[model samples]
Target: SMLAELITSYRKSIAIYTFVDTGLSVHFKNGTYMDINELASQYGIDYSRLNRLCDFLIEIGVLVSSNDRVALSEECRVLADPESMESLIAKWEFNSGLWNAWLMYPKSLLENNGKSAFEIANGKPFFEYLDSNKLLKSKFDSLMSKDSDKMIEKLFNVYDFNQHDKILDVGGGEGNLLIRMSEKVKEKHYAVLDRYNELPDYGNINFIDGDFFKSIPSGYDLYILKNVIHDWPDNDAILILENCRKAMGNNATILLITLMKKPQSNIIKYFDILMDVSSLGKERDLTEFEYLANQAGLVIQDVKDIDESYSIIQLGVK
Candidate 1:
């Protein structure tokens, strides 16, 4: 039964393959279907292999074959519409890029090189790729925007921003959270600190184009870092935190809104692996976060659990 369940879970691969195939299919974009033989010759793929793949996709309910043309199924249409599909395909692209670099996982494991898999593979870091590749950067920004949208409602529900006068969204991308929070907390002036280029032109939200790792802006009674610390290992995480601590007054509150990784959760484990492969990043348990907070000269006031597997780690200057 366990083996069968594992095999069932592996069906996600078929779903992803079908999505990519359909995304590339001429029929997907309302184009006419070319003859399979001619298409295979033109595309340089074996017609037999393509046909077999199509058959498997159809069997898995991700594709449908008719009139010598293959198309995505309605089920696939629903699944592919979600942003998760884009994230999955991005992972596939990352994996492909890693493979192309003649870098394999086992070799890295043996070497214990301090570099991430992307560093070993590409000779540069993930953020460097983000800067160099416009499309990838846009995709990442869109993903972050989607995440902000998803978390906005829960954030409003869990925290009372009304108490604070000035609210700073640290590492705020494009000022989505601050913009939304500004609407809720009427008296509070909202400020967003990020790489200024990433912030959109919103007159209501003050955009600080600065690096949080070096220094944080002061005078904000409340500061928030959403999904930021998980991107770095503990030392860097503390550095960012300490910077925030320096900026925050004794009475100020700091919010670290993030997904708390549990030991048994496969989703968090997968995230850990992906982060490990792509960057020098690691998810943390509560104790790890507490230790980091203490080291950074901050006190963990409370951890408010929100909907959808995220928690707001509230901090105060010690």
Candidate 2:
């Protein structure tokens, strides 16, 4: 049974790889059902490999094959569309280096030397590696910004933005989130702080090119560290939070937008494991969040549920 499961997993991975690499998934959008041989010839892939991939995809309900002709299943039609979320997942999965670094998980666990698997495998951290590669950096930023755009859209529906007169987004890449908010509520002053060379052309929002750990710009009514604090170890996380605390006005509130790990599912657990290997970070539960907030001279004022996967942890001066 274990052997069977392993085989199933291998098949699934291979199917995904084939769909992404050979562009088989996107071909369905042409509305032409393709046979394995035809697909292989069109994509310049081996017939046997393409047939095997199609067989697995059919087994997984991603494809429907009848009399040697195959079409994408209704459930998997989204994969044919480039703008779909499934396409994003496929792109993220195709990251060969990330997957290679993941293979060093056991060694990383044993060593526990505070060095990430990315660093161990590539002689540099994940972000550094991305920075060195222009194409990869652009792709990474685009993918991340797309996801963030969706999250911020959901956030706008749930949270009221009119309460804060001034808002600062620390480590905000390209200031997309702040820009979105500014578009919604034009009255509020929005700003972003990060290590960017040139800021985007936004009229309302201010840009500060600096590190959050060193110092945060002051005078904002609210400071946001969206999906940022989770990427560092506790000490560094604390230091960043402390800087935000120091920079905050007396009545300023701090918001940490991150996914909270619940006990029920292993989705966040997998993410935590990935973070452990790729970065020296781990997802935290509410108790750990409270402890970290206290360490940073702040207290948990409120925990607003953004959705099932993410939450807004509000902090105030202790």
Candidate 3:
């Protein structure tokens, strides 16, 4: 039954993350394990309990055993590689907090009504809570940067940054996208406008310490909102676009870079509800993008795909 599947998903996810968190996954990279007890001794895990966990992981194919030795399953290698940030395993440490927030999903609708899942689990909204917690914020920032890094790597293939010489990234943490862009196009002046902080200088990547709701820096050739707009509800999203419209120079272009929705697609749909649960945002379809742009006194110029699941939307002042 579906309920049975849902229940097992919890254990499978728990089993995998436990293997990761316990730092057992990396040992496989050293070589196929010599013995589970050797691991048990070095990691300070009792032998019998380690065997139990290993059995479950073996059952789930996250680990494989032969000749009384173990290694990461063929399919799970990237997940166990500590050097990589692009895989979900790199984000595993934050899963518990996300799961806690998700547990409040039912409450968000049934009892809390107006609040998001993160708010129901914690006291404040998602971003507000993130701002106050230093450690968590850094982890979140690291994860966000991975996305930004990957986005730019793929973005070069789909969209042209050379179309604009002066660019601004609104609400970009550390302005990673801008910094990455500057590396490729040295002549362009890249700026990041975000909340006030001790943002040090990058020769070509400038920092404009500001808030998007309060104001945005003007007269750029391009305004890049990478994973920014999908963090708010309809009214707030519109308000952000309005601000972008207000800040654009006569020939400036605005880009909404995010995971966009399309018909018969499921992954983006999951992200749609993920933003809904964690924040007040939802992913947009083409029609919804047009609606939001028109609402913000702009019109859709083009929609470019970065990959199967991501896109860059161009908007112009109407």
Pick the lDDT winner: 2
Model 3, runs deviating above 4 Å: 30-34, 83-96, 111-113, 200-203
- Candidate 1 or 2, higher lDDT? 2
Model 3 residue 295 lDDT score: 96
Per-residue lDDT tens digits for candidate 2, residues 112-150, read: 888888788878888778767766665565666666778
Instruction: List pairs with backbone clashes in candidate 3.
Output: none
lDDT of 3 by residue, 63-170 (tens): 889888878777776665664573343454445556788888887878756689888778788777766776667667667777777778788887888878788888
Report the error of model 1 at residue 288, Å.
Answer: 0.4
Instruction: State the TM-score for model 3.
Output: 0.91
Instruction: Return the candidate ranking by TM-score, descending.
Output: 3, 2, 1
Better of 2 and 3 by TM-score: 3
TM-score of each: 0.77, 0.88, 0.91
Model 1 — TM-score against the truth? 0.77
